[model samples]
Target: NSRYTHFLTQHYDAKPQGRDDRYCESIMRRRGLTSPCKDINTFIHGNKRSIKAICENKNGNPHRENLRISKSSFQVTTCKLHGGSPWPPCQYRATAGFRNVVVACENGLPVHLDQSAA
Candidate 1:
């Protein structure tokens, strides 16, 4: 049971250097996604253990059902379509920052993320 691919593909970056536009394009290119520009994508730049901790105690508290709240902040980057289309002529802008996040777990492992300042 794993979308292990989804998580690794969309969000994980071990030592993400502050999202330079150059970094975003090449990364997407390397990911080999069906479309070069996804309209939008976010990356949580951190160690795997830092993220996993969000769900480790997840027995989901009052936070709700599936997704849980973070116990700390994270530096995440967002790459958005600034021009072009799904075609190779794709273009994007990468915006990054540190914020508390909400995440969904895949068996006790962090998978999905929503950036929030609160």
Candidate 2:
């Protein structure tokens, strides 16, 4: 049930050192989820970090996929660090940033932003 935890732990260990030490430390300091495992369920099932399939189109293609976006105390997944005070990408810092993400989907439709309003 809690597969995302495995995913995080796996990736976290695999890429232990982030390109930027500050970002890595920030993630650990802010978004690091402690057990009983806060991130495991969210990563896999919560649809916040993942997605929730809604309905399909006329051609049996998914037309709507919902995202249950939630704020991680730390940015653990796919966060890249750059120089300057701005630090993370602008999109990552704002709601509109989620729109820039290219998520893999069955129908190639954009993710539903019900809960992903930046």
Candidate 3:
């Protein structure tokens, strides 16, 4: 009942707020709330690579170059934060790769802390 109520609240909220609610369900389901997203396509299509590629620009990277940060700024900030503590070699390739990865799901999946509305 709690989960159902949460879902109901989230569903209506999604409609008015233009924010997604499916990505906010992990905790509710852990307490026995099940989503009504039975259509796997509706749940998994967004997360798939092929579908994303279709929407991406020709560079094969989906990210917008305009949104990119300067490498010099990143290095300076990271060095300041770590203060020459001998951190592991920076892995921008892996970091960039993972950032490019997307997971599309139904409207009520749990949103990551960084991506959550909160």
Top-TM-score structure, candidate number: 1
Q: What is the lDDT of candidate 3?
A: 0.22
Query: Candidate 3: minimum summed lDDT over ten consecutive residues — where?
Result: 73-82
Give me the runs in candidate 2 sitting further than 4 Å from their true place: 6-25, 28-50, 54-78, 83-96, 100-118
Candidate that beats the other on lDDT, 1 or 2, i.e. the better one:
1
lDDT to native, each model: 0.68, 0.28, 0.22
Q: lDDT by residue for model 3 over 49-110, one digit each (tens)? A: 33223223321232243221111111000001112322322111101001222222223332
For residues 62-113, could you state the per-residue lDDT of candidate 1 as single tens digits?
2557668777778887777776567775676878778656777777676676
Worst 10 residues of 1 by lDDT: 56-65
All models, RMSD in angstroms: 3.1, 12.6, 16.8
Question: What local lDDT score does residue 98 receive in model 3, on the 0 to 100 scale?
Answer: 12
Give stretches of model 3 more than 4 Å off: 1-23, 26-51, 54-98, 102-118
Residue 90 in candidate 1 has what lDDT?
62
Better of 1 and 3 by lDDT: 1
Least well predicted 10-residue stretch by lDDT in candidate 2: 89-98
Error of 1 at 76 (Å): 0.9
lDDT of 1 at 22: 72
Tell me the tens digit of each residue's lDDT in model 2 across 1-118: 2343333332332233433434333443344432221221111112332232222232123223443222222223333222333322222211101222212232433232222221
